[PDB]
Design a protein around this ligand. Structure first.
Ligand SMILES: C[C@@H](NS(C)(=O)=O)c1ccccc1Cl
Length: 284
């Protein structure tokens, strides 16, 4: 039996290596990674890989790994797939911990925009969790933390993290992690997966997929939002992604909104992430 070596970037930035039989389905690798992480609440997570145009794809746990990575290296990342709208309801602190690690990367990367004060508050909870109670000894007036807090660091931000850290004396890691989540979960881009698209008039938009529904970011003025109840059906054809919207009571006919995606693969990827999030919505 022939086995392929897999490399998985974990959310702490470390590498996990294991072997699976070469015809293995994604679930086999995912189960190994989750066991390594002592993770039981597995349904919120997934593995991604980078394709031959270097975009993120979810590894489908039901399909052979070889038919998804195809020509590429068996290199993957471990990621949050479904962001819980209420992290306080997860059963395990270790689940909340990995969710925090993912969000820290969402913030540093700029995928999750955050005000100065929220960047500092989130950072303050990360420090409390990681180092425990504030200590002046390892924090001079010139202190800069090893922790990455934001897409752009300033001395201002470092100082505000320290000032807020001082207020958390006696907080345990699980408590600090829960506060981090209670704040992060309220950010307007929490758990929003963004896709570049053009509207039916060829105007560049962003489509966001999340637990509550679909977002169309035409720009800062006019964000259209479709709760999952409002979406009748989704479809893709060629480079096109179409959404059917229920009529208001007594209107007779649903409306169709069409979008142009970069290519066929980008359309299919959007479709699949919408289907997966809609099932998520359905079962909450
Ligand atoms: C899961 C998906 N099915 S379908 C028939 O492909 O549109 C769906 C069905 C109703 C609303 C939204 C979505 Cl995403």
């Amino acid at each position: 039996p022939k086995s392929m070596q897999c490399k998985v970037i974990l959310l702490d930035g470390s590498e996990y290596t294991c072997d699976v039989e070469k015809r293995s389905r994604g679930q086999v690798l995912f189960d190994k990674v989750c066991e390594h992480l002592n993770l039981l609440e597995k349904d919120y997570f997934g593995l991604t890989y980078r394709d031959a145009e270097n975009q993120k794809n979810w590894l489908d746990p039901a399909k052979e790994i070889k038919k998804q990575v195809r020509s590429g290296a068996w290199h993957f990342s471990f990621n949050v797939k479904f962001y819980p709208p209420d992290p306080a309801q997860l059963s395990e602190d270790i689940t909340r911990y990995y969710l925090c690690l993912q969000l820290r990367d969402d913030i540093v990367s700029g995928r999750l925009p955050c005000s100065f004060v929220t960047l500092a508050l989130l950072g303050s909870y990360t420090v409390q969790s990681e180092l425990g109670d504030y200590d002046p000894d390892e924090c001079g007036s010139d202190y800069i933390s090893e922790f990455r807090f934001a897409p752009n660091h300033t001395k201002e931000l470092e100082d505000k993290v320290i000032e807020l850290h001082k207020s958390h004396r006696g907080m345990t890691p699980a408590e600090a992690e829960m506060h981090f989540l209670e704040n992060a979960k309220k950010l307007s881009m929490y758990g929003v997966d963004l896709h570049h698209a053009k509207d039916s008039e060829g105007v560049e938009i962003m489509l966001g997929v999340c637990a509550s529904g679909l977002l169309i970011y035409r720009d800062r003025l006019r964000i259209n939002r479709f709760a999952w109840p409002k979406v009748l059906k989704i479809s893709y054809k060629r480079n096109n992604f179409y959404i059917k919207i229920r009529p208001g009571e007594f209107e007779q006919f649903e409306s169709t909104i069409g979008f142009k995606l970069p290519n066929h693969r980008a359309a299919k990827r959007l479709w699949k992430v919408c289907v997966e999030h809609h099932t998520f919505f359905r079962l909450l």
